[model samples]
Target: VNSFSGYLKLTDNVYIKNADIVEEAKKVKPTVVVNAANVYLKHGGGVAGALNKATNNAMQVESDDYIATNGPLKVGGSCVLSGHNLAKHCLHVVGPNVNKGEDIQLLKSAYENFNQHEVLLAPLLSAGIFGADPIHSLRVCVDTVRTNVYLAVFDKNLYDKLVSSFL
Candidate 1:
């Protein structure tokens, strides 16, 4: 899913099928879009590596705007050390994951950072970091940000979660 300048694009893939973020995006016209890909748990060496590759691909398509990671954990590896990382920007959202308040605080911070851009990619469940409940994860993510949101759903289940909520 993607949102830019009041336009929202939602894909009904297997992972995310019935999401209502598009409607929300139309109402807000957000500048950034978020991807909920299972970064840390995925095989391509986690979020950093995957993001690096994704950013590189974006660059190739002339869409290499920037990439940002939101969470409290510190990412380490060649992706961070290389200095030539694919994205034009990378960020780590800070807050205590142990409490909802902290999550909200971190979410606000993420939105603040996001306000500086025109597009964003955020994930749904955060999989490894926040478990696999797309509904809960998305709720927090949506509540955290005050602007329009374009949620990424990789399959139908994820899409159902968002869509079901609307129903």
Candidate 2:
């Protein structure tokens, strides 16, 4: 079940799947790809790391430029980054780290910052290294993201949980 490669249609414009977003982004070629970023937008690990690797660290250089210009992004804050070969641009959001005593509002605000678009690729923000509950994260993701979404779920168990709970 965790290994399922197919997707679940959550709505007319939303889909969820168990896949690598770095790979999926190539096929989808969405206008904006959302990266769950840190305050400094470092692509050190998890989704960010994978994206950085796929782009040969080009994305990280863009991230570095953004941080240098604007300083650190606050929790729930966002920045549009150079996408290289991934998409037109990347939407970077610093989701709240629950392990750091952050609240859900910051997480939800991360989603709320997204505006209308033709298509947007996303991952489960804050659910990985940030220690956010999958259920809560998915709820906020679905409720707040305003674009036509294709959510990439890396973990099979979390994918199953999302399907079972939401579908």
Candidate 3:
């Protein structure tokens, strides 16, 4: 069975697991998988690249079309794109360029925007090239999740920290 290993509860509705984000997305139905994406929606590297690869680059084409029509994604903004292959849909969330300042507000706003989703499959956002602290990002993620959330933690160190902090 294509089951997630399991999850640790951060809240009643927020859960975390050390597993592959794309694989988990495939196991669930009618869920929007998240991509920790750039403003342009170019899935060239990092988590974005992995998602784009999993979706067979259809996301890249859709992103191009969306950007061409809607322009660059702004900080704290999100775009929902049609999924390909094993995904149902993909939510493209743009995290703040925190190098500019301590912009947790933008992160919070992004999560608030995500509140509408019934079931959210997300990877840890920011703390990559976007420059937010990983621990802070995870805290903001769990704090703001309003629905059933399955968080995919790919890093063993971060996974351990998450378990230690919440479990």
Which RMSD values do the candidates have, in order?
9.8, 3.8, 2.5
**Model 2 Cα lDDT, one tens digit per residue, 1-167:** 12223678887666799988998878766678889888988889989999889999999887888778889998998888777898878988888988888887788788876754557788888889888997888888778876677789998888988898894
Give the residue spans of candidate 3 off by over 4 A: 1-5, 99-102
Measured by C-alpha RMSD in angstroms, how accurate is candidate 2? 3.8
Candidate 3 per-residue lDDT over residues 29-135, each given as its tens digit: 43578888878898998788887898788889989999999999887889888867656778888887676664667898777656878777887777666677777
Give the TM-score of each candidate. 0.42, 0.90, 0.88
**TM-score leader:** 2
* Model 2: CA > 4 A from native: 1-6
Q: Tell me which residue pairs clash in candidate 3.
A: none
Score candidate 3 by TM-score against the native.
Answer: 0.88
Candidate-wise lDDT, in order: 0.36, 0.82, 0.78
Superposed by TM-score, candidate 3 places the C-alpha of residue 16 at a distance from the truth, in angstroms, of 0.0
Kindly report which residue stretches of model 1 are placed more than 4 angstroms away from their true locations once superposed: 1-48, 55-118, 128-132
